[PDB]
Amino acid sequence: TSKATIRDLNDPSQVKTLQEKASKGAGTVVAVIDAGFDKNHEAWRLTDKTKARYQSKEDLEKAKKEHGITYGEWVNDKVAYYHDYSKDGKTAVDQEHGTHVSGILSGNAPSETKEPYRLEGAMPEAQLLLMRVEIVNGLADYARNYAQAIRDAVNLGAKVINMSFGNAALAYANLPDETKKAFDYAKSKGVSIVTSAGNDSSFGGKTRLPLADHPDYGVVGTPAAADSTLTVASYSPDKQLTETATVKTDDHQAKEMPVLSTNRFEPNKAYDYAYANRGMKEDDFKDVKGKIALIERGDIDFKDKIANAKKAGAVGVLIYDNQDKGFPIELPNVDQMPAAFISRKDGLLLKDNSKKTITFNATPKVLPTASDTKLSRFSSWGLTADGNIKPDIAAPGQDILSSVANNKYAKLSGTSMSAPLVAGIMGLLQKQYETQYPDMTPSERLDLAKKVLMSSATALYDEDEKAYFSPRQQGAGAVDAKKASAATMYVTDKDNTSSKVHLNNVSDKFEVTVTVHNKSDKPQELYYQATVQTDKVDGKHFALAPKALYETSWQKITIPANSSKQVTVPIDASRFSKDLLAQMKNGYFLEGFVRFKQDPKKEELMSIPYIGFRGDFGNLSALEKPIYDSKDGSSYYHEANSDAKDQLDGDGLQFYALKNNFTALTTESNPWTIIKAVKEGVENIEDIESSEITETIFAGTFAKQDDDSHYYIHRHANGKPYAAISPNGDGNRDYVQFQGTFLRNAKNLVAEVLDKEGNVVWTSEVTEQVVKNYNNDLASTLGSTRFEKTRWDGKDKDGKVVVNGTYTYRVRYTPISSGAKEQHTDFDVIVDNTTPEVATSATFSTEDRRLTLASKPKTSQPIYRERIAYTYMDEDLPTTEYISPNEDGTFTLPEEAETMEGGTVPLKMSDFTYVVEDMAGNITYTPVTKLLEGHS
Ligand SMILES: [Ca+2]
Ligand code: NA
């Protein structure tokens, strides 16, 4: 029995055509640098080991000796080398991702596989060098480790190195020099390095849209940002080999639909199903018992919808999209529950179908995708931190079936899956070129291969928008191995360095110059046109969709044999500026593709992207304005309480900092009971000595005298936040520290204090590298960052507390863009260490229980709170509550306190304490019994 391969049934990138020309990798070596692998998978095999570069452990050891490599080992005929460059890591090794990526590149499953179709990667007959690397310490360390892996791969003979991993938003400039040299080393040896773009979409993440005011929303990081690598974005072709389910529709006709299942349904079993809305309430499931629950996506998590269906006795789950032309989403495994994701159209078909019975088939088949040809929502957008164009090209990355741990298979989505496909195509094209262009050096063939793959890639078109997807999302287009293998021409920028044109900043009128290279022995004539486009905007947000402005007229060019010729396309978008600026006030991209054809009526032959920015890109604001300045109290990652726009509670007892992610200043509130306990040397305080807590809060915020559980922003008459500190070491409002939501990466972040008299009296340590807060999720990065180096303790550069007064706490930082001006954000900060002068005696009226103080408080800063606290035992815990003064200045003392259990506890005069605090946090606390004894 000989099984067909998945590629035999579906080959969106036309890899077979290139293989017809360049074979399947026999005799070649390729490397994968990832997080771990199943080195024993059945997919790791060669049809004829006699043709391999390394025919034995001895052949391998010989190569190792030649290069002085004294580690790593031969595994089997397919995996000629394996080394873990991150063994110091205590955590376990994940084998799924690396195995899956490697499978797409070089899997070669035998017919004895349990699968219906054999996994046969792009270069199934090549040997693999598998290198494990993982972050175990810092990122610089990590980069030095994968740098050695790259170098070892090159020396061990790899022709391509796939790196389907990365860290969002990092700048290439910050990588260790040894890492930069390793990329250059591979390039100098003609070894292609392919990187995944990332799955972070744009600033804000896959669940949000970035703001139109802030155009630098790219999140591609490293290693992708390295210019020498070929970075791959992910898209979905218009058809996919998918598992399916069959249903009978009204017409009495059978209808097949794609399904993406987690866990397994009983094949060929007719199941009954019931609609259950968005599966939020039990009511919804009032009929799913013993049937499959059909649930619409939205509102709540997939896991919840699934758990709820299980509760109601459902035997399986069908979740249909709430988006039109969406993508299949891998549903969570909630305690083995069979759960399948289907398109909205298919879900709606099931929803209103007479015979509510469905069957799952065992044989997968190719069916159209609900998305049609479309870039993946998760694919990372460029530009890179220093403004270079990435990604470079796109490849299929949705629900790709490949090898996983323990000799199994599974579908995974990600640019991680797109990359190895391109890596294999690059390897085969390089092999083809060893025959086609034998007189070039390995480096020259590599350069040619990358240019041809990018030029021949087909620019994808957004049908809904009537425009090509932005080059910042798809790079030079979707890879096509057939077009690449057939190509005898390619297109580059005027300097012949890359198949993309970066114009940096532009006015409404600019020129796009392209060089067409002809490697044929005959002159060739082409027609070319340029699309002119920008970002589509919906309200205050970028839609992450293209907006066509116009397309130029087709012009012609004849390129002599074995030569090149430049063409220049004049662009003028002056007529759109008024409307575009109204939408994108700080500037917008003017970009597109210069497309080439043999005839205007024929298909696109080549396309090269160009990108310019109508504005001053390098100087776009790097920091989101302070939350205090927001008119409606909201920010990108923080929604206000419309009912109270000035409410701004602090950290409370939260464990993670998912809330309140915005730019502001932090400080700490230390209640008098804790200040007292610390001054007295009490060691165990929390939940023992007091019921109050030390809380990290935002500077400029204050609680009301009658606690309501909230803090509110207070501002000077001028509108600035009333930030004030009392640097006296009691932990109560002793300092201010910068917290920022960075919209763009930055460098050399430093805080300084001006005395508003012309002098800088203090300067913090510098935070050299700042990464934009591209999401607000524990799985990637939080929406804001607290910079401990900027903490100011109210002391000057000589180490002494500055005199009472108002100062400017200035935070400076510079964008990464070449030549950007330093930017800064300022906050007025008051320093006042004046202790309140308060009554030293009092008298008490037993009749009405009113306490009258001998005098009123005198404070430098306005009074914040003046209260009488009472601490009573509630299950052995000294619990404190407060009393605000009467309008005549006296305080009415209660005779008892109510406990949580609902009981009562008598209060003694010794339970009361007079506490006075000013707006800088200066405070006094005197036992009421002491005031009463305050008489001679
Ligand atoms: Ca203080
Ligand atoms: Na292209």
Side-chain angles (χ1 to χ4, degrees), residues 455-500:
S455 294
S456 67
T458 305
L460 297 184
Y461 192 81
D462 188 331
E463 290 300 358
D464 295 323
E465 307 308 326
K466 269 40 188 166
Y468 291 87
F469 296 89
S470 174
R472 281 167 300 115
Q473 181 181 43
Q474 74 170 303
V479 65
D480 188 316
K482 172 175 179 181
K483 288 176 60 188
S485 184
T488 53
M489 292 184 277
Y490 59 96
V491 290
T492 67
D493 69 296
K494 72 182 64 168
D495 297 315
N496 306 328
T497 63
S498 47
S499 289
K500 43 187 183 176

Side-chain angles (χ1 to χ4, degrees), residues 725-734 833 920-922:
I725 58 175
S726 40
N728 54 19
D730 63 5
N732 187 44
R733 295 166 186 269
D734 286 357
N833 251 170
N922 288 293

